[PDB]
Amino acid sequence: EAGTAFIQTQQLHAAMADTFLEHMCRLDIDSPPITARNTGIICTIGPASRSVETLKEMIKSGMNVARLNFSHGTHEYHAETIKNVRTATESFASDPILYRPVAVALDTKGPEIRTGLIKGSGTAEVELKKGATLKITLDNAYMEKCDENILWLDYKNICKVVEVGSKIYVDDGLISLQVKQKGADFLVTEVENGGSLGSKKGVNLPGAAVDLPAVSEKDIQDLKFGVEQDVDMVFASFIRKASDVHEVRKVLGEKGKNIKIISKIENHEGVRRFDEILEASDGIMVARGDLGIEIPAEKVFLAQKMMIGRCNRAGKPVICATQMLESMIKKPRPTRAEGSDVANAVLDGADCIMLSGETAKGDYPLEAVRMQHLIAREAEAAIYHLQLFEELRRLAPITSDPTEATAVGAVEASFKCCSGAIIVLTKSGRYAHQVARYRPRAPIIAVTRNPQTARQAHLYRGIFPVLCKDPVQEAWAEDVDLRVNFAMNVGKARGFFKKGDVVIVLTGWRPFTNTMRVVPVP
Amino acid sequence: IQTQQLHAAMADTFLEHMCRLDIDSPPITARNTGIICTIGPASRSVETLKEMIKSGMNVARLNFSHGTHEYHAETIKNVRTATESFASDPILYRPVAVALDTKGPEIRTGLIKGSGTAEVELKKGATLKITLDNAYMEKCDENILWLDYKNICKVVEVGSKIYVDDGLISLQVKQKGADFLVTEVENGGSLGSKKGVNLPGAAVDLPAVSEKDIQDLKFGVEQDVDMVFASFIRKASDVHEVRKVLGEKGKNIKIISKIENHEGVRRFDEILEASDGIMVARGDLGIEIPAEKVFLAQKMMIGRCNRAGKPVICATQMLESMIKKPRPTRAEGSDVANAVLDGADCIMLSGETAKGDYPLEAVRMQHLIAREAEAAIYHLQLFEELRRLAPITSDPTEATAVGAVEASFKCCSGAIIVLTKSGRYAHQVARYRPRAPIIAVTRNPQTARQAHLYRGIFPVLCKDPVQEAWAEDVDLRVNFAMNVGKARGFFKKGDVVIVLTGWRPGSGFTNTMRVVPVP
Lengths: 522, 519
Ligand SMILES: O=C([O-])C(=O)[O-]
Ligand SMILES: O=C([O-])C(=O)[O-]
Ligand SMILES: [K+]
Ligand SMILES: [K+]
Ligand SMILES: [Mg+2]
Ligand SMILES: [Mg+2]
Known about the structure:
Two copies of one chain form a homodimer.
Chain A: H1 12-15, H2 20-25, E1 40-44, H3 52-61, E2 65-69, H4 75-90, E3 103-107, E4 113-114, E5 126-128, E6 133-137, E7 150-152, H5 158-161, E8 167-170, E9 175-182, E10 186-193, E11 195-197, E12 202-204, H6 217-228, E13 233-236, H7 242-251, E14 260-265, H8 268-272, H9 274-280, E15 283-287, H10 288-294, H11 300-314, E16 318-321, H12 336-348, E17 352-355, H13 357-360, H14 365-382, H15 385-394, H16 402-416, E18 422-425, H17 430-436, E19 444-448, H18 451-456, E20 463-467, H19 476-494, E21 502-506, E22 516-520
Parallel strand pairs in A: 1-2, 1-17, 2-3, 3-13, 6-7, 13-14, 14-15, 15-16, 16-17, 18-19, 18-21, 19-20
Antiparallel strand pairs in A: 4-12, 5-11, 6-10, 8-9, 8-12, 9-10, 21-22
Helix pairs in contact in A: 3-4, 3-14, 7-9, 12-14, 16-17
Binding site for Mg(2+) (chain B): 260, 284
Binding site for L-serine (chain B): 58, 94, 452
Family (chain B): Belongs to the pyruvate kinase family.
């Protein structure tokens, strides 16, 4: 009864524009997005978020992956976090229609450089003043006696790799020092950018060839623990070259062979060697915290868009990480730059976006999760699928693989009929991954009986995993019908589609494979 | 390998364009995006302003939400002293524009009662009474909060939401009175003095141009400001009111309409038609509408301004953490880059330069990021689409401008040099968004300052007397641009530059294009 003033939902007017410029001109704050949200949300768990009750609310707010940061905390601490994540996750298991799989990710310490404890209790801070002198020492007598005159750090070969004139950054790159004099086991520096220095802060040596192992002996101990704890994926810090990825993967052994290996790119060499790292990895994290200290801050966006582009081209998951909503550690709503950053990461093509301090330590963890969910959904509607889908195909090789032809045909069909979902029956995840790489607008409901598949599927844009708990039916067609009906019930319950809407169904392995059907929702 | 992201520039798809972006491909020296800096206590001294200019500031913004006319006159005096301290070298001198940002139909709280804590703690669930009784205008505390919107009770009802201080504090109306509201704290926090208030659910009925705004705009005319940033523009008739106040004496002052509420977004096209340009004023906008929708409004407005060839400014919290820290967050570095990639003519700093501890670092970071992002633009697609969407016309000047931009791509020119009295001839080149900088030579000092509103226009103020022969005077001005470009490192001998000049004496056509090896 309103009239022609009706506004197309999910930016459909912008979607039909013949140019990218006119696409932008048509973006409409009054065009509401669809219910489905395709970008995975990864949350770092810490003191602010590790209670079972908070974790339940984080799952409800949209958390898909729990990130454990092994730069901090002992093994018992992480074991208890994992236990709590699973308690919270399985509290929803009585209703398989609404249960959300939640993945567990181990983020390695890796070749970090860290300072010591400020003298006193270690909880105090000292003020470093611009122009003052600061001695860096390796003598362990000072490892708990750091102050404004002497700073201990844990990198035993630092004096070899730096030179007079080199810059040293401390604490998220906020403190900067210039090396004035070198010593046998010390450096004499002058404070350039001063500030308040606390304990055990990260140190970066841009332009220095740091020779710490990609995976140290202690890192291996963490990875072994991760296999014991049945984690789903490893985020490997400071990956510099393909062989670093192999050091992570091979040490997990046969028992850990299905754990996904995500290489974190956070230094100049990792960017330079990106193609060989990507080839060896299951996926990539754009780890912008260290990256933006190791290279100039003004170049990070180039590295981010390069890596997201190349991961999209290869069909491998890419995560955009660090400081996306940083002010929400202390404030209940984000800055305008932060809202923009999350939206542009999704428009760039990131499969997942991440929260670190915002959920690990901050005062508003749920609000931060909720805001990533809201922004992601708005940005997903704004993607110019007409160009993106055309380019993904053209940059995708002709192969004789029938399963790739099925996947692109399914996504093509999904665009042609504006389907409410692509339902995919998958054991390993592969069939759903193949669909996700062509970036449909519609959500991909991936039905699996494999619990690890259901958890790992969150690495891909658009894959909404659902874990089927029913016994296998002896008749294959009846087993397919059961799993398809499950996905139909999930989509109706979640508001992705309604009775009578059109969806695409990919029925997975048949004892041809992965038949496609385009059907109305029953 | 190749500089200036030229490998990415040759990609056949946008996806491959992204894949080819190279942190080891260094940009050109020239920086095309204008930098607007809000001046305040951190940046008001002549000594600091000199460094701001050296660091890349093109426009000084004066925020008339605060301060007296005496105060702002002294700020403007200091800006001009700093700017003219470089005039002894006319080849390196940079014009610096002055922008008056109006208070507009702002809502603000009063002063916190000065006898207690400087801020009061508002706690979730607590009662807070909003009063209009000016007895409390300097006695605000956790029990009673005065604000200056005297008609607020008419436009809210029970249940309305009220946001305070960058929308971080929120209240819900519970009852109403003759001159007061009873509210409950929804989101609490620490409340200081004179904080901005938003009523996103309400039709605020304050005048587009208040009596105070009239005084401020007339003062801007008297002070010879270059442009007005008009706050809270909701509709074309608001722009008309501003232009009427500026009147005949102020007729050449540029009006930039600030879009910061839902109505301004809805009525954007008619606002854009009447305005000289647009500010995406994201602070208020992100409170008036859901924070997750601001990027849609931003890219819509930048796109439509690019389509119209009118300047668009991206503003507010771009480098916000640099108020307190010497380096920005990763989201902030991304935000500045993406504003440039979106197509913003200018980017802006507010608290980062007005009040913060690191104003020079913030200016320098905007310069660095903008230049990197300018190289990463996919000009192949942008130029094709700008051409396809431009209005149809047989105008010789427009055809020469497009020809010059295409020529500049074909030879990777070091600059496009254009001569202009009032700015338009340079504006016409900028709207097709060449990669090369546009060195706009003018003898008009106001044109030189106003040109900063456009992406890529590097104004140079020629101070030589007019030569007797028209052709010699053209050559003098072109040679001035050539020497400026050489001195600034934009090009050197063996490079090629595009030169646009007028047809002949008495013609208004800029219809002559020369492709000049740099001598
Ligand atoms: O390690 C990280 O996540 C980073 O540095 O961004
Ligand atoms: O007024 C402004 O600049 C804003 O609100 O962003
Ligand atoms: K880590
Ligand atoms: K203002
Ligand atoms: Mg890191
Ligand atoms: Mg405002």
